């Protein structure tokens, strides 16, 4: 069955030019049309462009200009390009396929500031019939991460809160999860953190 | 581009409840209406599921109904469940397709106290410096919360960050975590930290402490 997968830098200054690429399996694009659409932070859906079979491309009026989409057949790639880039163009960014299935999407900012991987600390449980842990997340940019528990094994109740901005102008967050007091002592719990744009990955032991 | 007005802009509802929300377009889509509808849950990475108006897409269920013609549209759940907590928004593909500003529709639910859990600055973090200790709320509603933080009995301001969580897919819940920052320093100084807690569902405030 078909999917997409988005990749791109994840962090890119302004006026430079952004590179995405969309790599498909489980159909061929001689069959179908791939279309891009983009969703800056707290706003709506933004149609891209797409590229037809034979494509033939169109885009979206307002940023045309700006904006190629190619593809290669071979490669089983369509490729977005956009240029003179301003933090406006912060977003994730989709490629698409009766229809129609997207990818998992590429978090793309916008800004001058340089790369920086995240500390992780965790948030270790103590002393009703159930308990918290967690891992701390602190100062990392941009956006995103992507925390998991247990390499993924864990993912009832867990929660992952938005990242929030430091006065550093950094972002951190907390990942919990809730367990049973009683399994405290046999169980152990570790956090998968990854944060893409600096090639950083941690796991964490967390000990009561 | 054609506008696609959608509305209204965020619907708050009971799970029993039968919903439905408009779209509108400045120009009619018909050659079969190219109007489509998506939902995209909480990041997820939208899913479509309508199209020509009033077509469901593959597993979709019956409770999703598509209609109107030419120019307005709407989308109805029937009996929303928890699950169905989502953002929706419309697309007209008839020119260059354009979405809609979209629909938040929140759950609505009973009210339910919170949990409250503390955290103190892990070893390792205090290793360079800083401090952050964590108050998390856990499961609750509404959304909606105050948290005051105390170290040894002194009142706290301007120190403390809040996060909230997207409301829960299955329960309508939310989490929030407190964070107050502090350097190693002011820390250390300190021996009792306390997040007091005032909720709707809290008859009296709650304070976790240590």
């Known amino acids: 069955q078909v999917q997409l997968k988005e990749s791109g830098p994840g962090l890119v200054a302004p006026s430079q030019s952004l590179s995405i690429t969309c790599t498909v399996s489980?159909?061929?694009?001689?069959?179908?049309?791939v279309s891009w659409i983009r969703q800056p932070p707290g706003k709506g859906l933004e149609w891209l462009g797409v590229?037809?079979?034979?494509?033939?491309?169109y885009y979206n009026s307002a940023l045309k200009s700006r904006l190629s989409i190619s593809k290669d057949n071979s490669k089983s790639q369509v490729f977005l390009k956009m240029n003179s880039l301003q933090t406006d163009d912060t977003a994730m960014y989709y490629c698409?396929?009766?229809?129609?299935?997207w990818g998992q999407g590429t978090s793309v900012t916008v800004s001058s500031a340089s790369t920086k991987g995240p500390s992780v600390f965790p948030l270790a449980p103590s002393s009703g019939g159930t308990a918290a842990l967690g891992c701390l997340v602190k100062d990392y940019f941009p956006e995103p991460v992507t925390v998991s528990w247990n390499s993924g094994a864990l993912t009832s109740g867990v929660h992952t809160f938005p990242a929030v901005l430091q006065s550093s102008g950094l972002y951190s967050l907390s990942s919990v999860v809730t367990v049973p007091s009683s399994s405290l002592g046999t169980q152990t719990y570790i956090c998968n953190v990854n944060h893409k744009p600096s090639n950083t990955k941690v796991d964490k032991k967390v000990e009561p | 581009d054609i506008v696609m007005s959608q509305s209204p802009s965020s619907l708050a509802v009971s799970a029993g409840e039968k919903v439905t929300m408009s779209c509108k377009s400045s120009?009619?889509?018909?050659?079969?209406?190219?109007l489509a509808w998506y939902q995209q849950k909480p990041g997820q990475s939208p899913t479509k599921l309508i199209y020509?108006?009033?077509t469901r897409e593959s597993g979709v269920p019956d409770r999703f109904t598509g209609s109107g013609s030419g120019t307005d549209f709407t989308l109805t759940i029937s009996s929303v469940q928890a699950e169905d907590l989502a953002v929706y928004y419309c697309?007209?593909?008839?020119?260059?397709?354009?979405f809609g500003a979209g629909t938040k529709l929140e759950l609505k639910r009973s009210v339910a106290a919170p949990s409250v859990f503390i955290f103190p600055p892990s070893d390792e973090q205090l290793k360079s410096g800083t401090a952050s200790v964590v108050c998390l709320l856990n499961n609750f509603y509404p959304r909606e919360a105050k948290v005051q933080w105390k170290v040894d009995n002194a009142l706290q301001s301007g120190n403390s960050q809040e996060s909230v969580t997207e409301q829960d897919s299955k329960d309508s819940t939310y989490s929030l975590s407190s964070t107050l920052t502090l350097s190693k320093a002011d820390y250390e100084k300190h021996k009792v930290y306390a997040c007091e807690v005032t909720h709707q569902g809290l008859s009296s405030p709650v304070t976790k402490s240590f």
């Open positions: 590229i037809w079979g034979g494509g033939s491309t």
């Open positions: 697309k007209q593909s008839y020119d260059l397709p354009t």
């Open positions: 120009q009619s889509l018909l050659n079969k209406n190219y």
């Open positions: 698409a396929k009766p229809g129609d299935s």
């Open positions: 020509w108006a009033s």
């Open positions: 489980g159909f061929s694009l001689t069959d179908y049309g």
